[PDB]
């Protein structure tokens, strides 16, 4: 919440690529977990299927043809390599963390996607014109103004209570 108020950190598209990598990374962990467990082969008579595997097997324990027929016919588009799949599970969480960590070297020197200009122009010439974007800037100056008296105690911010921006009744 420091980098939200002062830096508008969710708006940085380097961070948006990071969220897509981490949510897409937890996506691929949930998919490939589920499809392998569910295209498994009968390798025993136990209802438990975990005991029907030994690590030294030469065969596959889930039907890659069946799993490809599943998602191609449900989602429309499916994998057909185990080598390309598992590189893609390597690739997506990792390149989320790189592109996100490029943008945090943005704020280190305060070059940041803070505002859109023409979006912020037209608001200052039309008091009719409100977006969710301008709603976020008012929330950002809530975080900027209220926290900073107790965020950085060494800089000795003394804020009058008429100075502190505030809505109606709260």
């Amino acid at each position: 919440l420091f980098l939200q108020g002062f830096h508008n950190w969710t708006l940085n598209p380097f961070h948006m690529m990071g969220v897509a990598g981490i949510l897409g990374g937890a996506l691929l962990c949930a998919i490939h977990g589920a499809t392998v467990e569910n295209t498994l082969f009968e390798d025993g008579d136990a209802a438990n299927t975990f005991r029907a595997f030994t690590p030294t097997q030469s065969e596959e324990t889930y039907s890659m043809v069946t799993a490809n027929r599943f998602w191609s016919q449900i989602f429309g588009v499916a994998f057909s390599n185990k080598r390309w799949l598992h590189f893609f599970m390597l690739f997506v969480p990792v390149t989320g963390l790189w592109t996100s960590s490029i943008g945090i070297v943005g704020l280190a020197l305060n070059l940041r996607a803070y505002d859109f200009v023409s979006q912020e122009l037209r608001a200052a010439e039309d008091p009719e014109f409100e977006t969710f974007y301008t709603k976020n800037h008012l929330l950002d100056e809530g975080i900027r103004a209220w926290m900073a008296a107790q965020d950085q105690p060494h800089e000795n911010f003394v804020f009058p209570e008429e100075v502190l921006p505030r809505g109606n009744a709260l």
Partner: peptide, 30 residues
């Protein structure tokens, strides 16, 4: 005039997905 550029790219991705589902390279067992 940038709402043209916005809707060209959004429909642009929607076109690419349509070719990616229905004109895909099919995998073969052979």
């Amino acid at each position: 005039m940038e709402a043209l550029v916005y809707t060209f790219l959004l429909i642009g991705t929607l076109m690419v997905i349509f070719f990616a589902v229905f004109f895909r390279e099919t995998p073969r067992i052979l």
